[PDB]
Design a protein around this nucleic acid. Structure first.
Lengths: 24, 102, 31, 51, 512
DNA sequence: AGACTTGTACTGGAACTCACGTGAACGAATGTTT
DNA sequence: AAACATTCGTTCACGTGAGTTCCAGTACAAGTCTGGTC
């Protein structure tokens, strides 16, 4: 399934934390 | 009538099992659909384990939501939210209201 | 941790105007 | 995925449906510390009693 | 902090002569005073209580004089409530065979509360009257009584066996006198301060709630490094637990100091060697191995932060902060600093801006130096009286569980039919817990669960009282009123009787 | 006859979760000393 | 009259016991296999 993590199958791959990024 | 500031504990998720009682899934789905249509939450008395005082809780229906890639982000079911008791609230000191210019 | 540098840079002079509008020239915070 | 409990929602005294309770948000705690013997660095068993 | 309550009672023969069905005022008065003493003793607010009776055979008062000030006895003086008072109320108090003027009782109680209040800082002084107002009396000193009541700032309260406020002329004259007294002390608002015995029984059947006081938390809301607003935070909503814990005592002697709990550590070897508490260290598990990590090393390597921080990380739309993600075990109410106009103005401006833009503030919160930092959401809360920020913790990346559940709408075998949906709609309609006010202004709550006292404390207090007064009998069953307050009005069940039957008929539920 | 394979249920243990109890720190109020 | 120390209710963190769900291991029934003899 798209987005599946390659380390732990059956768990959604978590996007890296980006903290706060102010918009334009 | 459910106050967002009346938070007492993290909410739980209620989902039909369809392993101990057969036919529960249909009733659960019907209840979810009707509650979503009428915008109501089921008030209930909750007792997790034996020898535990009951707690008044509310079940808010949840509607399935999928992202652009058709990946679940909000499973369907009920959201169990705990409601505080009378003693769970604390009195606040009286403060005069000072307004701000536009 | 708040990005103090970025917030200061974005708020060019808004904080000064807000302080002038609200805080008189005698108020001292954190004291 | 694991069910915290399997309960029976009771609309009445004769309408009952089995449901399961899950926790989608749980606090993350450090792994519990373990007591270790300094000399051999092997686990030490702990016991408690009253007298 | 403390209050003095001088309970006046009438122990004359008039009440004893009454219809048995009416539950003559003697037993009602005893019941109400017993419940009041129970609430006071089981809720330690440091309130002093004394008992005075008028209409008894004996006479024991500081003032004797002539024929006046007679048949009045001060049974108890101002002191902390205790079970001895309950025991005396149960049996020690018995009816008399005389009559007395309740005005004399009032003057005696004023004398007692003035003489025995010296040396104690009591901010309140309530005098309660329990009488049938059926005793012949003369009015010749009300002016001085009212003057003393006003000068001493003593509150007065009355209870009678009737609700109005079918009676004899003497009762009517007594009612006139009491009404005049209340009108003089307070005025129009004092007319309703006369409470019938049954109405009092209605409100005194529940133990007082656990009322803890939240200490103010001062800090500074900082937007960047140049803007700072002094703020004070209080704990609004939290789970309440018993203040007093159970103490383990030796079964025979019933003494705490006769028991000592301790822990020992022994090795896993066959010989079962003994290892002292100075010969052990702390460690963690890393996969299939164990890595030592001493406490001093952990403190050295520990994450160090600056405590007492309330910083606005950013501002985000309210729609992006869902309620289901709220975490923690507390809700914080943030107001402006006490006696600070500039801080109040700044906080009001921020709250109004957030409300207008429909935004919330993602902020960092730390109680003190040794408190783990938290990321939370603060949102406005504006009311006609006061406006304040409401802060609730938010989850971290590690606190989210990613579980996948099968869909219900798309399931072929779990699709309800039209009849099932109609029946469920009927069930929901019948079991409504909110009623529109004649479709005029707003809704009204039939079953408000926020105002229901926690039954755990009620049960604990009931059982403790039953054991204290009856050390030999077993515990009693749960009181019926607790169940009544823990259940919805019977009207909902009556309306839902039939829809539930239809649900049972339509849905083939079977247990396996 | 004997021995190995498949299955079968049952027992106990690991891990997770909650409630309850203990330890330590702390801000505000009060009392004492200069 | 002002400054400093002590105390008390409050708060947070950490540790220990009891309940629930999922999984590894064990004793034994039965199926299956096999050898020797007349």
């Amino acid at each position: 399934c798209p987005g599946e993590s390659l380390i732990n199958p059956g768990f959604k791959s978590k996007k890296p934390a980006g903290g706060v990024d102010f918009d334009e | 009538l459910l106050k967002k500031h009346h938070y007492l504990r993290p909410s739980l998720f209620v989902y039909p099992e369809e392993s101990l009682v057969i036919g529960s899934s249909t009733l659960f789905s019907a209840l979810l659909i009707k509650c979503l249509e009428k915008e109501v939450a089921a008030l209930c008395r909750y007792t997790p384990r034996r020898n535990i005082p009951p707690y008044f809780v509310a079940l808010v229906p949840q509607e399935e939501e999928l992202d652009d890639q058709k990946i679940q982000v909000t499973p369907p079911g009920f959201q169990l939210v705990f409601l505080p008791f009378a003693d769970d609230k604390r009195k606040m000191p009286f403060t005069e209201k000072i307004m701000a210019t536009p | 941790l708040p990005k103090v540098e970025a917030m200061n840079k974005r708020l060019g002079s808004l904080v000064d105007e807000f302080k002038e509008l609200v805080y008189p020239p005698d108020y001292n915070p954190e004291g | 995925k694991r069910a915290l409990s399997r309960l029976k929602l009771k609309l009445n005294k004769d309408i009952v449906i089995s449901v399961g309770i899950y926790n989608l948000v749980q606090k993350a705690l450090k792994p519990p510390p373990i007591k270790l013997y300094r000399e051999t660095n092997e686990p030490v068993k702990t016991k408690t009693r009253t007298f | 902090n403390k209050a003095a309550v001088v309970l006046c009672m009438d122990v004359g023969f008039t009440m004893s002569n009454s219809i048995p069905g009416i539950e003559s005022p003697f037993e009602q008065a005893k019941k109400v005073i017993t419940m009041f003493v129970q609430r006071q003793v089981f809720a330690e607010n440091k309130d002093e209580i004394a008992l005075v009776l008028f209409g008894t055979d004996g006479t024991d008062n500081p003032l004797s004089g002539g024929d006046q000030y007679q048949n009045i006895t001060v049974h108890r003086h101002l002191m902390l409530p205790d079970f001895d008072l309950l025991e005396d109320i149960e049996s020690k108090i018995q009816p008399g065979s005389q009559q007395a003027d309740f005005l004399d009782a009032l003057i005696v109680s004023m004398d007692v509360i003035q003489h025995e209040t010296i040396g104690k800082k009591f901010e309140k002084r309530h005098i309660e009257i329990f009488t049938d107002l059926s005793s012949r009396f003369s009015k010749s000193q009300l002016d001085i009584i009212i003057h003393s009541l006003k000068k001493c700032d003593i509150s007065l309260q009355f209870f009678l066996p009737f609700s109005l406020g079918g009676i004899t002329e003497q009762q009517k004259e007594g009612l006139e006198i009491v009404k005049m007294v209340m009108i003089s002390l307070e005025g129009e608002d004092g007319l309703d301060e006369i409470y019938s015995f049954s109405e009092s029984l209605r409100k005194l059947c529940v133990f007082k709630k656990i009322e803890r006081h939240s200490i103010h938390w001062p800090c500074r809301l900082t937007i960047g490094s140049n803007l700072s607003i002094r703020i004070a935070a209080y704990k609004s909503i939290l789970q309440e637990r018993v203040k007093k814990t159970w103490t383990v005592v030796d079964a025979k002697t019933l003494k705490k100091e006769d028991i000592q709990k301790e822990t020992v550590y022994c090795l896993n070897d066959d010989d079962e060697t003994e290892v002292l508490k100075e010969d052990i260290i702390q460690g963690f598990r890393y996969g299939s191995d164990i890595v030592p990590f001493s406490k001093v090393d952990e403190e050295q390597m520990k994450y160090k932060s600056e405590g007492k921080c309330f910083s606005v990380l950013g501002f985000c739309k309210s729609s992006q902060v869902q309620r289901r993600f709220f975490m923690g075990n507390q809700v914080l109410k943030v107001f402006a600093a006490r006696d600070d106009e500039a801080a109040a103005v700044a906080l009001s401006s921020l709250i109004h801006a957030l409300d207008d833009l429909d935004m919330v503030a993602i902020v960092r919160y730390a109680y003190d130096k040794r408190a783990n930092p938290q990321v939370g959401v603060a949102f406005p809360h504006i009311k006609h009286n006061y406006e304040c920020l409401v802060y609730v913790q938010l989850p971290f990346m590690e606190d989210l569980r990613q579980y996948m559940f099968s869909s219900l709408k798309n399931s072929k075998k779990y699709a309800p039919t039209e009849a099932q949906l109609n029946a469920v709609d009927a069930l929901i309609d019948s079991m409504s817990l909110a009623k529109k006010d004649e479709k005029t202004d707003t809704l009204e709550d039939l079953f408000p669960t926020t105002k229901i006292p926690n039954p755990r404390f009620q049960r604990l207090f009931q059982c403790l009282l039953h054991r204290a007064l009856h050390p030999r009998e077993p515990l009693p069953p749960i009181q019926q009123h607790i169940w009544n307050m823990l259940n919805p009005p019977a009207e909902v069940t009556t309306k839902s009787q039939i829809p539930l039957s239809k649900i049972k008929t339509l849905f083939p539920l079977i247990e396996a």
